[model samples]
Target chain A: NALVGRIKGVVKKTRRPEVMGALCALPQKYREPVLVSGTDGVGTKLRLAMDLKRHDTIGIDLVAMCVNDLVVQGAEPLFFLDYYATGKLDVDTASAVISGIAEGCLQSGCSLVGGETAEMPGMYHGEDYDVAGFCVGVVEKSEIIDGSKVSDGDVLIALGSSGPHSNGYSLVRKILEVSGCDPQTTELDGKPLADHLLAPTRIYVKSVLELIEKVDVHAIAHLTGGGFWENIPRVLPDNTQAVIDESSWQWPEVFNWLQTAGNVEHHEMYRTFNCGVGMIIALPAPEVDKALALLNANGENAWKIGIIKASDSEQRVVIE
Target chain B: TSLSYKDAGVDIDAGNALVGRIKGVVKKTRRPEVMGGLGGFGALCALPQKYREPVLVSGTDGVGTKLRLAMDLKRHDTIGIDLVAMCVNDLVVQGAEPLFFLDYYATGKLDVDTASAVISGIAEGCLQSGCSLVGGETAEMPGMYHGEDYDVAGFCVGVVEKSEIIDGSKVSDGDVLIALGSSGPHSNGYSLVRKILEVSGCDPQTTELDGKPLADHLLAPTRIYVKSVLELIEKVDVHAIAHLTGGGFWENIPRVLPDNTQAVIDESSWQWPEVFNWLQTAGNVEHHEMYRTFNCGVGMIIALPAPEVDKALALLNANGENAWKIGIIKASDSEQRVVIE
Candidate 1:
């Protein structure tokens, strides 16, 4: 009771402000529910997190990979559904993991909404865990941002990354561990590699949308597992090829080291890692400067990595 | 030391109690639409005749770190609201009116009171959304969740007209952006909040806001947008509606806009709530950083006509509501997006 009164003094001043203004606006124009759907998993990131003894940041990865894809189709992520299956329930462990998920939603501009936590005791090693995220975003039918608008002469604007965002962690883990790099060791350039590797997925919705305002991006692709080589083509209209000039952009030092250590080829490097780019906006030729400006103002250093070109025949993404 | 699961943190007794609490609350919210009690493996709800040309919409979600509050408070009832909010919110996004809900809860040991509180919370959410409280599963494993720790999820089914579904293709530039307010933080961003708290050494339960407990304030039920959004379906020429969930206004508003169309939101259009400001200050976050991460108050947004804004706001007002003209759509050279400035 004594403690309660002490806490009460602090509570009165810090209560959540009434969200009346936004609530008051809701009743008038609620439209039909936009069917925004996406499903994705935190493939192998769980192991990476475990090896590093970090539990929190990976949940954001689980939430982002799924929800980012939902937004690509122009669906505002409505509710995120997650599937967290584990050998057992470690409350602190689970809390450390999921609290990050909630934080991710707050950053992505959506509710943590809902998700599932499953305890499958015999499913794997006692300490092992895995997770997946499914998201539904709202979009009007007429405005869905499909890759259909991508055409020849469109510009490829690469949104600079904080590091190797989410993709190729499996390989990175294998190479680093094989070369006797401790997961917990912060040796390279004097920073904790685990912390660097486990940096929470950056929320790009604001920056991406900021660019969407000032420029004419036909399609936006979140650079994930296959990096630019795989994801960019998905949004490209059948015939046109995206000619990406690698020389126009620079790779983050961490990624460059991974390439050198792994003995990975340039083509494989682009195919495997985000390099320095986490997202790419495919836009028309004229709007490059405005798009870059918008992203820059938002603190994202976007670059003009390449452009689309016409082929006498249908073309895919080409690297120079 | 024969320390069973509870010693590790999972409370089996609490789990069973929660199941019982939900059973009672579900009974309280029972309508003719509910076909059965909270007994079957899956929930059973009848498709009410009110829904014409109904196509079933189902969604599932888990309550993320908000469970931390529930765990700390030893308060389980309200977390179910987060669970149902997570699922039914998605059902509404697809333009479906949620009919019934089910829950899945897993814990190492069960604490009856804690579990009941959680189920009671779920029941309240169903009532708020006018959905039936159906069945659910409460699994008590020997060595699962640590003592007093439980994780919850909800699965909801709604029905809507196939033709009436708003799938975002109709959104266009020149549409006015209407902002709908959110209830507190809703169910997002507790991880960063927790980290901030860890750095600050703040306890949610012991923390107080306006003479009330912080957990009580933060535990405010997720606003049931399903009912309100459904009410507005016929009143406005809503080209598209976006439920600002994990991505907030930044990622969600553009999801429904047409190609080469973008929403230009006037940053000063609405007031950024104190909770967001508080989170920012505690974390030393920046302006754009806050906008990118949190809702900054706007939860759901609609892209409609400049002309229809008055009618929509009026109709909403008649329903005793208020709407803010947050932004407008402009012809973009590229894909759909929002202009934050």
Candidate 2:
């Protein structure tokens, strides 16, 4: 009940009136509103947040992890729920973690309707926690984006990432262990190393949702755990390949520092981390400028990074 | 042969094999609305048109430390059943038909056999609960977890007619409580169970319940009430349904009762399962603590008018669940909402 009150403080701003009942009630709004659901965790990046004792932005990472996947399917996230499990129930820590989740829901235009906090003493360690988020969104059936329309000669547009986002933290932790970098003292641009590495995963729902409405978008990929090697191919047509130009965008310093310190190879960097790009949208080549204008006008750093091309080989991703 | 530690991260082959092994089981939970195959960024489902005004009832839960038992016993199969049952049970209590389920399985080193066994159990739970195992994330976080140890979290979304949502406001003082039997602890009170097991030195294999090994009793998959409860609701005008979960009778039963009424459970009504009896003797747990700590054999409590009690019981019994007249709702001015007579 105390947890409810804590979460209520966060969700009161965006709580649905229909959800005031004993159960969450969603009114039938769309004629063909297909349900889109996704479940994801912030991975070991949670360990980094816990180590930093910064719980506020981790929920943003949690929310961004799942809702981004929904938006890729052209679904506008409707509600979000979180599972926060810990060894003991420290009310303050739990509140901080959930407030971050609430903050995430608010950013992505989704209501934080429900959540569960499990205090299993033996399951987790002292003050240590793991978080997984779930989000449900609805998109009209006709508007669903399955990448079937992706064709050769379509231009690939890239959306810049917020640091490494939630992916590749396992590698990040490994890099830190090997490099022995001080999170607090190390400087990047004007901030501490911790600030860049622990930056909340950017939520692209607002920009992408707007872009899709304005631009003739065919396919979109949320560059997540698999990075370019794995996530990009999920949307590419079987007869085509995604050709990403390495010189199109500059890699962020955190990524460069990670690569140099950890001695991680170029291909491994693309395979593991987002490598400066958070999302990749494929659309007809002619509309590239207009789409870039809209994204830049919306405050998103957008660039024409690659192109979809006819492939004679089986490789789905070709980074030149 | 020495098992050398390579990178100590995720094993892609093991994860792939685990997914391959459970593909068949996952197919068992398929519905027509499942838009794409297993390999998608997200699972998609179309809304059913039955409800003119549909209300979404969603719940998320984990199996608690009960997962430790499964891992220790190496019986990886049914714990996923407990995971799905935990979430779906809550949804059905709100009179929602569970549509789909997604799971988050995080572990240190990916063991193909263990992960497959665990997912198979999840599929079994989905089959029982009538929800599709649409999508799931199997996060192999090596540094974040102990070796081969994993944690599971489940999320379920269901729909009910907006007008027909059961909020227990209709539960009045003369409403009869029909109890449904639980299959062991039903994914709660495991921390206490482990403590009792250690302090009492009771051999899980040696102890007998119903001439069956006590381990079998403890590891029994949670009894899913979705199908049976849904059947009862279709035939009877059910006032309220209370799922006996973590808070047990004292807490969960009162959750569905009005402030002016109390659920007076007749303690003599049902025989205690042997597992609970052993727990009581080993832990020296008091009556009230037992009611608050464990289900004490009751998994679900259905409240309806006195006249509809028999009909609900008949339906539940015929549907293969052992149902009984456990207690009645009575007017109470005290804040104590549940009384074991």
Candidate 3:
């Protein structure tokens, strides 16, 4: 019953699992509904959390990884549920994770609908846990943003990323291991390297939704796993390419440190990490300033990072 | 292993190939409602235009230690069925028809055949439940799980007309209770079942029940009750439908019952399945614990008016369900909400 009234959507007093009767009570306008959903996990970042014993913020990372995916397609996130599995159950640790998830749901303006916590003896290694997140968002049928509108001369606006987000962490660990530096002891910009590496991925749902309202947005891409090389091209048409201006912004200092220490190639870095941008938004040139102003006002450090251009042969995303 | 992601025990090609193997089976589970193709960051679906005011019901569940048993026995196929059944059955109990499903598979290493087999089972379960398997995530976390050992969690969203959502407020005195027979233990009570196996020194793989291998009974997939229960609710004035899952009769039944009412089950109406009886005898589990831990035989318990019970049973049986009159609703005290008498 402690969880009953806490979430706005959970239907109460019915019993199956006897925990939460999940239903959204938002008034029905009876509009045609297109539901957008995504499922993702915080990849090998679990190892970083394990080393740092940081249990709380990964839930935020989990929520960000999934919710940000849905928001890119112009959906308003409605509910979030998490699947948390651990080898051994610790009430405090699991509680901290849930609290962070609640924080993320609040960040994305979605209710924390429900969650599943499984404690298996043999599956997960001791004291180790893996997180997977699911978020369902709703967009009106007529308003959904597919990449069909992206064209040449469109401006690409980049929203700043906090860190590597949830991807490339397996590579990060190997970087840490091969570099032979103590992440706990090594300092970057007055914080420990571990803190920089562990910064929670940014959630762009709120500000991006605001930007979508004011601007005739062509396409939006959330730079997640596969980074710019793989993710950016997904929202581009076959005769178009994204020409990123590398001089437009500097890589977040933590990335510079990862690049130097890990000996990761520059192209691979773009492929693996966000470098600095969490998302790239495409709109006609006229709306760039308004979009930037609105995004900055909403706490996103946003800027024009690239431009869309015509290609003769194939879709290419170039950084020069 | 090289330091690059391709060499870091994560084969992106293998993952991509797994996707290739998955798309065909996943496509077969598609309901016309599913929108877009497989490569998008998010899966999209349009709600059916049938309901005037649609209420969405969603639930997430794992097979618990049953995944441990599923892995130990090298049975990957049906466990996915168990996973989808666990989630969808919960939604159907809320009187919602499942629309879409997603799964999360985390493993120590990615094995194409194993992953394909598991997801194909998931698709089968989704098709059976009439929900589309629209999206899934496969994570190869090197150190998270043991070699060839994996865990799966299922989430499903369903829609029901706001007026028809079953909350059991209509359940009252003298309503008859109908039991839908379970397929084995229905993904619950496996923790105790494993303990029972260890204590009794029984080799489930080699041992035999009356007609089958002991392992066959232990690993039986959870049945999907969506179609039958949905059929029963329409023809019958259904009060409540309880999915007999993890907490078996004691916990799950009370979930759908009002405070002042209880269920008096006719224990003699049907015999316990052979698997459950073996669980009781070998584990020396108490009567109350048996009911608390295992479904015993019932997978779903429905409450309806006495007059409409026969019609509901006939419809359910016509729909290929093993249905029977299991009990009656009775007035309750503070003592017990459910009693097998």
Could you give candidate 1's per-residue lDDT for residues B1-341 as a string of tens digits?
Answer: 22111222223235445655455667877767553311121223344566444455656666666776556666666677778776777776657787776666555456566667777888888888878775655555433355556656666666776677777776776788887777777777666666777787777677766677666656676766776677777676677777676666677776777677888889888887667766787789887666666677876787777888887777665654446888888888875467787
lDDT of 2 by residue, B1-341 (tens): 11111234355456556777788889889987778822377788887778777888887888877888777777778998999998888888878988999998888877777777888888888888889999888877665576667888999999888788888898888989999999898888888888888898877877777899878888899999999988888899888899998788877887877778888888899998888988999999897788888999999999999998878888899989989999998888875788888
**lDDT digits (tens) for residues A1-320 of candidate 1:** 32233323322332122111001011112243334444555544565677667886877886777667656655555455466667666666767766677666666665544445654443334776555555544554455565667777888888787776666665676557546767566455576666667776666766665555466557888887667766777777666778888798877777766776666677767766788888878888778877777777778877899887766555477887
TM-score for model 3? 0.95
Compute the DockQ of candidate 1.
0.03
Q: Is the docking of candidate 3 incorrect, acceptable, medium or high quality?
A: medium
Error of 2 at B191 (Å): 2.7
Interface RMSDs of the predictions, in order, are: 15.4, 4.7, 2.4
Query: Each predicted complex: what DockQ?
Result: 0.03, 0.48, 0.55
Span of 10 residues, lowest total lDDT, candidate 3 chain A: A10-19
Ranking by DockQ: 3, 2, 1
**How good is chain A of candidate 1, measured by TM-score?**
0.86
Stretches of candidate 2 exceeding 4 Å from the true structure: A1-5, A27-29, B1-17, B37-39, B333-335
List, residue by residue over A96-181, the lDDT tens digit for candidate 3: 77777877877888877777777887777778888778988888778888888899899999999998988888788878888899
User: Model 2, residue B334: what's the lDDT?
Assistant: 76
Residue B156 C-alpha lDDT in model 1: 69
Docking class of 1: incorrect
**How much DockQ does model 2 earn?**
0.48
